[model samples]
Target: GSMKSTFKSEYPFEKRKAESERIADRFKNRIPVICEKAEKSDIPEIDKRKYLVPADLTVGQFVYVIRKRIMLPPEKAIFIFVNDTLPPTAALMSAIYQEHKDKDGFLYVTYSGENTFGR
Candidate 1:
C-alpha cells in the first residue's frame, strides 16, 4: 500500500481502509441511506454498476453502504473513488455534495436506517 503510482495519489490504501473502518464503527446505528428507490426508479440497469459499494459501513449500530466512486473536486478535477457513505438526511452528508453534480448511482441495505423518515 505504500507504493506510489501515477494511477493514484500518494495516499496509502491501507490508511484509507482503516479510516473507512473507523467511520463505519463510529456511525453504525447512526448510518443513513445514501440513495432511495424513488431516486433509483428511473435508472437503467446498465448504469448502476458505476455506483456499486464494495462494503457496508456502520453508524452507531446500523449498517450503511460505503461508497467507492472517485470524484475529484473543482480544484483538482480528479475523480478518485471514495470509500465513505452519505446519510440521506444528515446535514454533514447532504452538504458536502452541494457544489458538484451527483453521480447517478447510490445504494442501501435491504432494510436499515430510518428509511421511514425520507428526509
Candidate 2:
C-alpha cells in the first residue's frame, strides 16, 4: 500500500533540495514540546522532547533502527552523523526523565540521528 504524503512531490535535485532545506530549517535544533509535571516540585513543566538521542548527532552514536515505522527498507534506515562537539544525548535523557520527573523510574531511551546526505 502507498503511504500518505511525506513530501509534496518528487522533483529535480534543485527543487527537492530547496524543499528539503526549507523543511530542515523549520525543524533544525527544534524539539517537540509537551506539558509535564513533577511530584516533588509543585510547579509543572514544559519539556522539549524527541531530539537526537543526544542533542547533536555524532559518529559514536551511529546505529540503525532494526524496527522502524517508515516504509523504507532497513538498509535505507541507517543513521550516521558527525557532531561539531559532543551531542546533547544527556539533555534528551533528562527530558525523558523529567517528562516523568513527577514519577519514579529510570528512563532509558535511544534514537537515530539526521541524515544530511539523504542516504
Candidate 3:
C-alpha cells in the first residue's frame, strides 16, 4: 500500500516567505547614491546614480545590484560605507540609511575601489 505524506504544523517555508515579503514592503522607498570617482571608476554618469533597492537585501546582494547597475564586472571590487562606518551584516540597511540620510532624503554612501574586508 502507498503511504501519504504527513503535514507538519511548522510550515517554515511559508513563514520565511511571509517575513521576506514584509521586509521588502518596508523598504519601498527609493534612494540615490553618488559614486566617489565616476570617470576614474569607469562608471557612466547616466548609468544609475539613483536606485530603488530593498533594505531586506543582504549587503552582498546589494553589492551585486550595484555592480549590475554600474555595469561593473563581477571581478571588480566595490566598497560601500555609510557615515564612514561599515554596516554589520545583521543590521537592516533601512535603519542605517535613515540615520545617515541627508536633508535631501538621499542616503550618503561612499564607494571606493576596495572591498569591505582588508585586502
Candidate 4:
C-alpha cells in the first residue's frame, strides 16, 4: 500500500538565522489555549493541557507537535476532527481556534492511541 503524506512549513531556509527569523514571524501570533484529551484518546502521557501555539500553524503541524510530545511510533497515525465530525486537514490554527473554541477560549482536542512525554 502507498500512503501519501503532506507536510508544510513556512520556515524552509538553509541558514539557521533565516529559519529562526521565519519561525519567529510565523508564530508571532501565538495563542494560549487549553487542549483536552478525549475519553478514548490513545495518548495519556501529557500533563500540561495548556499550550502556546502559533496561530498560523496548520492542523498537520499541530498533529506533529502532538506526535512529538507523545513520542508516538511511526507505525501509528493521528486522527483528528472538529465537532467530532469535521475532517482534519491543513486548516490554520487561528481559524479553528476562533470558530470552534469554547467560551473560555479552550481549544478542545481529543486523542485515542498512545502516551505522551514532556517537552
Candidate 5:
C-alpha cells in the first residue's frame, strides 16, 4: 500500500485487493490492519496505515502495539472500534477480521484517545 487512507473505500480498491492478497499469501499468518485516528480524536495519526497483525493476536495486544506506535505513555487512554462495534480487549483479531474485514481484504480499525486508560 503506497499509504494514507483512513478507510478501505478511500483506498484504491483493486490495488488493495492485490496487495492484501499478496500479504495474506506472503506473510501467511498475518492480517493487514489498516488503522486511523477516529474522528475528532486527540491522538496523533499513526506513521503508516498498513500494519501486519498476527492471526492469533488479541485486541489488547494490537492496541498495545498501536499505543506503542503512537508513543503514548501507559497512563493515556485510547478507544478502538471495528466497524462501529466496540470490540473487547480479549477478542481475537482473526475473528474480528473474519467478521469485519472489508472488501479490499484488509482489516480496518479506528481509534480515539486521551488518557487515564478510559475513554
Candidate 6:
C-alpha cells in the first residue's frame, strides 16, 4: 500500500535548504527541525512537521514535547530515531543536529510509537 510521506520526500532539497537558512539567520539559538512519523506506525500524525527547536534542549526532553503534541497516552511509549539509530535522550539537540542534520542542514528526526519488537 502507498504510505505516509515525509517533508524531505515531499519537498525539494533546495526549498528546504532555503527555508532552513532563513530560519537559521533569524533564530541563531534555535535549530531547524523537520520531524516525521514512521511510515508504518499507527500513532496519529502530527500536524506541524517543521520545528525550530532550542539548541540547548535534550533529546530526552524533546521527546516528551513530541509525545504530548501527538497526545500519546502517558502510558504509551514513543521513540525518536536519527540516522536509523536511536539516540540517548540525554544528548543535546545542538549535538544531535551537528551529527545528524540532513544534507540541507535541517535536523531530521523520525518518531515511531511502535513496539520495538515486531509481530
Q: Tell me, by lDDT, which candidate is best.
A: 6
Ranking by lDDT: 6, 5, 4, 3, 2, 1
TM-score of candidate 4 relative to the true fold? 0.60
Cα misplacement distance, residue 63 of candidate 4 (Å) = 1.0
Per-residue CA lDDT of model 5 for 1-119, tens digit only, reads 89765776666664555776776677778777777776566678777656788898899897777777777787877767876677788999999998886887878888777323445
The model with the greatest TM-score is 6
lDDT of 6 by residue, 1-119 (tens): 59755676666654466776777687778888788887788887888767778888888888888878787887887878886777787888899899986887878888888636654
Misplaced by over 4 Å in model 4 are 1-27, 114-119
lDDT of 3 by residue, 14-116 (tens): 4355765775677675445444442344444434444556656455667656666667677765656676577765556677777877788866666666543
What would the TM-scores of all predictions be? 0.21, 0.19, 0.52, 0.60, 0.66, 0.69
User: How much is the lDDT of residue 50 in candidate 5?
Assistant: 66
lDDT of 4 by residue, 24-49 (tens): 77667876655666765545647645
Q: Clashes per prediction?
A: 19, 5, 0, 8, 1, 1
lDDT of 1 by residue, 13-82 (tens): 5446576577566655332234322332322222223232223332322222222122213332111111
Worst 10 residues of 5 by lDDT: 110-119
Task: Give the residue spans of candidate 2 off by over 4 A.
Answer: 1-67, 80-91, 95-114, 117-119
- The predictions' CA RMSDs to the true structure, in order, are 13.6, 17.6, 11.7, 13.0, 9.3, 10.0
- lDDT for 51 in candidate 3 is 52
Estimate every model's Cα lDDT from 0 to 1.
0.32, 0.35, 0.60, 0.65, 0.76, 0.79
TM-score of candidate 6 versus the correct structure, residues matched by position: 0.69
Better of 2 and 5 by TM-score: 5
> What is candidate 2's CA lDDT for residue 67?
22
